[PDB]
């Protein structure tokens, strides 16, 4: 009659064995089966590499003359509850769900025998909404809040104001061109202090909600700079709370991580996925691509249009740094000749900045782009790409910024001609006096030329690297270089900005067809013909840009992010479902 | 001389219709693959155009980069012969 | 119902006299394009592997610079 408890920690004598993690036995059992599944998928099995480099041909070509809308089985799972998932009618989906760590797909019989291939489910949130419902994840987040004694600095109010910010149809598209011209540089941002100090002030007076939340670099700069009574106080307190949330959440995650190391390196890169540096943020303005090649023991391969770049010594052949804009003054016309006399298709040169040396080790923008933003705003933004030449022709072929005898502190909206900057500034209704538009145009001396998308393929961790197939120990991830992720578009906005922005549905959180159909009139026909594709989980995306099986965030994350109520519990649940399924992840989960 | 039949199942006899002697064809998937692969074939033809031109540009480029060393070598051999 | 032609060995293909003589020629036309694209990327990596040789030779000649 002793009341013995059975914790999780006493089950680690079986839950941490490698035999639970090798799918080689179950792939031997599946591939020797005398009758495999007839319904094969062939939508997002393998990321094919593009030959060209510009992504506008990939997006436009992908949606041009398309009438086939197939969906993957992982998206087929998380659309129905538990009670009918185990029904005998859904045996075709139940046939392959036979391991929690492995969503085994069959592929195609394009060769001789179609082989059941196993890709490892990385984090715990990749379990389907059948076998792990969403309320269970929010309650695990509430366990995470009390297990680490997290102090949420955000209330409901900041979450709802960023929520209806990202549901504003009349979001100012001029903020996109400000974000595009600055694009995450400190010395460029100090040129635009009276620009953005007027921008977010007049947005706070026109609509009450805050702006510029669609990029980490802008809100980080607003946390660093502009606290000197530039913006109104209640607008700045939202940005200060948002930046306090990421450092508080990272402190909670390392309280989960614990003070134990393996070898000499921390265990924090094994237990979580946000603390893993090998996960990369989905938008990179500065260089991090040379940075993780110096810090990773697992070998990554940053595939830039079937160019490998697997070693750190060949850095300037694939990526050049623009540095600061002062040393570039000898090569301004050289960079312009590279712009106008360069073949940008089949150009495998990345135009980035230097790696900034912060102490955070790149975890804060991963948190902001992965657990903060797609839950306070229910996965309803897409990653667009700018053409820098067209916005450069916009901001300098106007009246007053060209003449330089038009004085500085006059309004620009009464003497600018009927260009596209006039209808850009009319639908937004801010009054940037000329001169703050002058250095805005003068940033073009070291802006990039195009927003390339690149598929970094980092190997798994050594705990979960037990698949026999050496092509599926890698979990790829696309990262949209130099372009900004952005919210929904008005049709008034899209008609005047079709010559400025093109949408790239690249990520599971950041490829969404409600926003993509606004700023792209190709998917606007595609979801007109296939309205079931309007869900974020079943949306088709280019497999040369986004391989859903070979991705860190799979479709159950998109199912949870689309239907979570934006609040504290949703944020804690999303950051609690980025825990990996490693044996030491089970150890650090059993400890707390 | 053929003959047309809906169905059968599972013979030992080699020339006998079945479900196992039925070829698993899908006209829609193959046509899309064809239409897309045709587009890929079309894009394959027009990469072999102007490597002659880029070769001429790299030839004149190495010419003007040999120009700097042909400039510098004689000036470096002049400045050390004044030691007499 | 859907009708399937039963397998007999007198079942002929749909008659193809004109099919192959242009097909092999356009095949070799695409084949030469494939081959000189592969030869182009071969020569690109071949010039990038030889270029570091002359730079390593120049950095070896930079030894004699340091004592002059």
């Amino acid at each position: 009659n002793l009341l013995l408890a059975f914790n999780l920690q006493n089950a680690l004598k079986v839950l941490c064995h490698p035999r639970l993690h090798t799918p080689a036995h179950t792939l031997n059992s599946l591939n020797a089966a005398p009758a495999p599944r007839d319904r094969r998928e062939t939508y997002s099995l393998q990321h094919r590499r593009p030959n060209h480099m510009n992504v506008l041909v990939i997006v436009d070509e992908f949606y041009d003359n398309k009438y086939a809308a197939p969906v993957t089985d992982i998206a087929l799972k998380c659309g129905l509850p538990t009670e009918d998932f185990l029904h005998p009618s859904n045996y075709d989906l139940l046939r392959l769900e036979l391991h929690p760590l492995y969503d085994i797909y069959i592929g195609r019989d394009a060769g001789e025998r179609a082989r059941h291939r196993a890709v490892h489910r990385l984090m715990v949130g990749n379990l389907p909404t059948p076998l792990a419902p969403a309320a269970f994840q929010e309650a695990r987040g509430q366990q995470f809040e009390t297990a680490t004694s997290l102090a949420h600095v955000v209330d409901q109010a900041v979450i709802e104001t960023v929520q209806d910010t990202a549901y504003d149809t009349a979001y100012p598209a001029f903020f996109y061109v400000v974000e595009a011209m600055i694009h995450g540089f400190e010395e460029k941002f100090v040129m635009n202090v009276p620009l953005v100090s007027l921008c977010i002030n007049t947005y706070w007076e026109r609509s009450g909600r805050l702006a510029f939340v669609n990029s980490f670099s802008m809100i980080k700069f607003i946390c660093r700079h502009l606290g000197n009574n530039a913006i109104s106080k209640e607008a700045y307190s939202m940005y200060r709370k948002i930046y306090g949330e990421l450092i508080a959440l990272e402190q909670a995650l390392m309280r989960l991580a614990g003070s134990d190391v393996v070898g000499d390196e921390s265990v924090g890169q094994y237990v979580c996925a946000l603390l893993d540096p090998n996960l990369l943020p989905p938008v990179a303005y500065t260089d991090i691509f040379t940075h993780l090649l110096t810090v990773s023991d697992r070998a990554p391969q940053i595939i830039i249009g079937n160019e490998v770049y697997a070693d750190t010594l060949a850095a300037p052949q694939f990526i050049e740094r623009v540095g600061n804009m002062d040393e570039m003054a000898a090569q301004f016309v050289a960079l312009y000749g590279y712009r106008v006399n360069g073949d940008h298709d089949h150009d495998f040169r990345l135009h980035l900045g230097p790696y900034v040396d912060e102490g955070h080790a790149d975890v804060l923008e991963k948190i902001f782009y992965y657990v903060f933003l797609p839950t306070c705003t229910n996965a309803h933004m897409c990653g667009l790409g700018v053409d820098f030449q067209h916005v450069a022709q916009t901001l300098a072929y106007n009246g007053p910024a060209f003449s330089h005898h038009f004085t500085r502190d006059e309004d620009i909206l009464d003497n600018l001609e009927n260009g596209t900057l006039r209808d850009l500034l009319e639908i937004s209704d801010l009054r940037p006096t000329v001169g703050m538009i002058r250095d805005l145009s003068a940033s073009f001396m070291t802006c990039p030329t195009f927003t390339r998308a690149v598929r970094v393929s980092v190997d798994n961790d050594v705990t979960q690297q037990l698949a026999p197939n050496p092509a599926d120990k890698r979990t790829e991830q696309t990262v949209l270089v130099n372009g900004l992720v952005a919210f929904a578009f008005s049709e008034r906005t899209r008609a005047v900005t079709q010559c400025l922005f093109h949408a790239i549905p690249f990520h599971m959180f950041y490829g969404d067809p409600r926003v993509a159909a606004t700023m792209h009139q190709d998917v606007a026909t595609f979801v007109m013909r296939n309205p079931q594709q309007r869900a974020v989980e079943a949306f088709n995306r280019p497999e040369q840009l986004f391989a859903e099986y070979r991705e860190w965030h799979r479709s159950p994350m998109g199912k949870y992010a689309a239907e979570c109520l934006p609040s504290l519990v949703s944020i804690s649940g999303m950051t609690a479902m980025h825990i990996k399924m490693s044996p030491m992840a089970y150890i650090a989960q059993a400890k707390l | 001389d053929p003959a047309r039949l809906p169905r059968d199942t599972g013979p030992e006899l080699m020339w006998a219709p079945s479900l196992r002697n039925s070829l698993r064809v899908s006209p829609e998937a193959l046509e899309l693959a064809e239409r897309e692969a045709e587009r890929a074939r079309s894009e394959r033809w027009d990469r072999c155009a102007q490597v002659l031109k880029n070769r001429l540009l790299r030839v004149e480029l190495d010419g003007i980069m040999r120009d700097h060393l042909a400039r510098a070598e004689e000036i470096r051999q002049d400045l050390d012969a004044v030691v007499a | 119902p859907e009708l399937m032609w039963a397998p007999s060995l007198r079942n002929s293909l749909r008659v193809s006299p004109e099919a192959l003589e242009l097909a092999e020629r356009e095949a070799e036309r695409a084949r030469s394009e494939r081959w000189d694209r592969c030869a182009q990327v071969l020569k690109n990596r071949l010039l990038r592997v030889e270029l570091d040789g002359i730079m390593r030779d120049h950095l070896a000649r930079a030894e004699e610079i340091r004592q002059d």
């Binding site: - | 190495d62 980069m65 700097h68 | 690109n44 120049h58």
Partner: peptide, 29 residues
């Protein structure tokens, strides 16, 4: 003895520069 310094700094400036020219070559292709 003043010739053995300016000449040396200028040939160091050109031996960095010829590497910059081959770097511009790698920038081309």
């Amino acid at each position: 003895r003043f010739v053995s310094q300016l000449r040396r700094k200028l040939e160091r400036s050109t031996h960095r520069l010829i590497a910059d020219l081959e770097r511009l070559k790698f920038l081309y292709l």
